[PDB]
């Protein structure tokens, strides 16, 4: 519900003197937004749901190629009609066999033959459609207010601290004004519009791994199939039968099932998680405008923390050009601002590292409180520092 | 000489393709007020100011004053993605569409 730790994160500084920002959210991604003199926040799309699909086709990979039949007809006696031709109980196909006296027939030459094999389905590579008002979005907003390695990911704690929220967006009401206590409020106007990709693509289902395939590659493929009935057509894939046999037995070899035919065309179609009745669109996106002239700082009338500050471990690389770390405050005093900055060289006067966790501060007055901090240090070597003078501590860092 | 409909408007289903580069759809008016003009247009992107989709059913409007009346509408949207919209501001609803 917040950005820290995610690989699909994007940092933003709307505009210059902007109280709003235009943005784009998608499936498993998050966004951290910064704005002069205002808290940092994370807009993130949580879920995409239709709050009703329908099947269209069903290609099979098969079994039942067990029962056999071979209606024999002697030369000049015409064709052969197998009783197993009255019901789709079996699939029949005619042929002719060279014969005569040698095998019970009176004359010599080509005799009719019409055998049949049975057909039912096993593994149905089912597929369905996606009709374009039932689309609802779930956006979660976080506030980079005080936190600890611990509480940073706990949705509960955060809501409790009024530093988080999870609301939904609908074509009905595409906006919302999420209130965050003394932090004012943020009002998004996400516009349900999305690419996005037209319903034109079919919904391919294969065993467990669902995919999104092109109407045609799918529809225009070669495999047995069935719409919404127990009736199957084109079962001709019950092939490699015509050993061009004898009236006794026509080998009806079950055609080897090679999932390669499918698998091979994997990459083409995009993969998608699908539960019995749901298809989370990633695939999908959402253009929003994070208006936030109503987003406001807090604890700005407090004094600076003046007591020792200790690191609780080597800062970590977020993989985003920023690092995280957690402090501990020896301080006995209450809610004070945390004096942390990024300095290019020990005892420089002017900072150089911008803090993601802007305007940090010890939340409680209960000494030895923890403080989480994410900041982007300058490239190359630099120093993170907390406190000043002889209280001040530091830890070096080198970005690349 | 009537005023614009000012009450919620709900879609009654996914617009349909006429096969002519236009689509059809039917609205329902929560409105209790009488014969007012239906505020529907085709917008290229949410909250744009100028329309882009020409309405076949020009100058549409709720025929009766009997709330929850239905309105049929055929309009040609622009190629590619676009948005159909009815009403404005926080009353306004919308539904996306992509012509080819």
């Amino acid at each position, epitope marked *: 519900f917040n950005c820290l730790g995610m690989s699909n994160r994007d940092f933003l500084e709307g505009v210059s003197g902007a109280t709003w920002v235009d943005l784009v959210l998608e499936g498993d991604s998050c966004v951290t937004i910064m704005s002069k003199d205002k808290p940092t926040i994370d807009v993130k799309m949580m879920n995409m*749901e*239709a*709050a009703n699909l329908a099947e269209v086709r069903s290609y099979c990979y098969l079994a039942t190629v067990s029962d056999l039949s071979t209606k024999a007809a002697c030369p000049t006696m015409g064709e052969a009609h197998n009783d197993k031709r009255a019901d789709p109980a079996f699939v029949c196909r005619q042929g002719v066999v060279d014969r005569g006296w040698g095998n019970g027939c009176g004359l010599f030459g080509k005799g009719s033959i019409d055998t049949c094999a049975k057909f039912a389905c096993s593994t149905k590579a089912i597929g369905r459609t996606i009709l374009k008002e*039932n689309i*609802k979005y*779930e956006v979660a907003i976080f506030v980079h207010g005080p936190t600890t390695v611990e509480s940073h990911g706990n949705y509960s704690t955060q809501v409790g601290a009024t530093q988080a929220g999870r609301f*939904s967006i609908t074509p009905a*009401a595409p906006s919302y004004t999420l209130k965050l206590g003394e932090y004012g409020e943020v009002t998004v106007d996400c516009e349900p519009r999305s690419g996005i990709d037209t319903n034109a693509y079919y919904v391919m289902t294969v065993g467990t791994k669902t995919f999104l395939v092109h109407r045609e590659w799918f529809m225009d493929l070669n495999l047995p199939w069935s719409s919404a009935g127990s009736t199957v057509w084109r079962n001709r894939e019950t092939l490699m039968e015509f050993e061009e046999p004898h009236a006794t037995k026509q080998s009806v070899i079950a055609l080897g099932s090679q999932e390669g035919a499918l698998h091979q065309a994997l990459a083409g179609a995009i993969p998608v998680e699908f539960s019995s009745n749901t298809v989370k669109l990633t695939s999908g996106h959402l253009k929003c405008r994070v208006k936030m002239e109503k987003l406001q700082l807090k604890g700005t009338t407090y004094g600076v923390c003046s007591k020792a500050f200790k690191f609780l471990g080597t800062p970590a690389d977020t993989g985003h050009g920023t690092v995280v770390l957690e402090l501990q405050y020896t301080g006995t005093d209450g809610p004070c601002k945390v004096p942390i900055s990024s300095v290019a060289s020990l005892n420089d006067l002017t900072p150089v590292g911008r803090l993601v966790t802007v305007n940090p501060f010890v939340s409680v007055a209960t000494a030895n409180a923890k403080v989480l901090i994410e900041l982007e240090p300058p490239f190359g070597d630099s120093y993170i520092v907390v406190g000043r003078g002889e209280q001040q501590i530091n830890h070096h860092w080198h970005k690349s | 000489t009537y005023g614009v409909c000012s009450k919620a408007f709900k879609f009654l289903g996914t617009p349909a393709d006429t096969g002519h580069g236009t689509v059809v759809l039917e609205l329902q008016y929560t409105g209790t007020d009488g014969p007012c003009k239906v505020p529907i247009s085709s917008v290229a992107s949410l909250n744009d100011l100028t329309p882009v989709g020409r309405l076949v059913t020009v100058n549409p409007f709720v025929s009766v004053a009997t709330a929850n009346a239905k309105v049929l509408i055929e309009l040609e949207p622009p190629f590619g993605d676009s948005y159909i919209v009815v009403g404005r501001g926080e009353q306004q609803i919308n539904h996306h569409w992509h012509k080819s």
Partner: antibody
Amino acid sequence: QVQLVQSGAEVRKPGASTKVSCKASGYTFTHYYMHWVRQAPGQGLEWMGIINPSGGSTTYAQKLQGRVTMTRDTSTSTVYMELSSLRSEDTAVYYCARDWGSNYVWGSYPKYWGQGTLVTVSS
Amino acid sequence: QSVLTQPSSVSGTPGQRVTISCSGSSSNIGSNTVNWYQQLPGTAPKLLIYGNNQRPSGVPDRFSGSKSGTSASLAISGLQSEDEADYYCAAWDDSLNGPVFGGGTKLTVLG
């Protein structure tokens, strides 16, 4: 799976009010409308109204307009129904039910039902 | 008094087919699709049919729905003892601007 857990049975005197809760889980709470439907003992189903947990907008049955209030708390995924000026005829099992998934109030219908809360109004 | 009209009671023997009617008007069934709910004794209703004739997953094919003009019908083939329940039809009503229900039918399964 969708789960809806309602508060326990209640008794009230005529003239009082009752507030019933429905705690939802197993789906994205703010993405589905919640309906309330009641059933007097031995009688049929009566729709009471619907609330959008996104934004909190409501539509109530005309016959209950003026003494029913539906609300929600999105942080606890709970929907509430309060009915005031109770009379004996309000004795019923009160069900909350998650909508099928409509994106519009029009054409919504209850699909996943809670276990019901019996409210008896008696002197 | 309910907006849609159903028989109060239907009965059948195990194995037979029974039907349950649901009559409405042009403002509900005439215009909009019909849903059916099954309510086993002592339990909440469950959705049985939606959109006139669609079954949710888990509902067997021997339950089938239909609609014709301003009326709808539920047919239950292969009647089983466990089918004994109250059945309710439902539809959106354009005139009332909300969902309406039938009065319910108690289905009893005889010996």
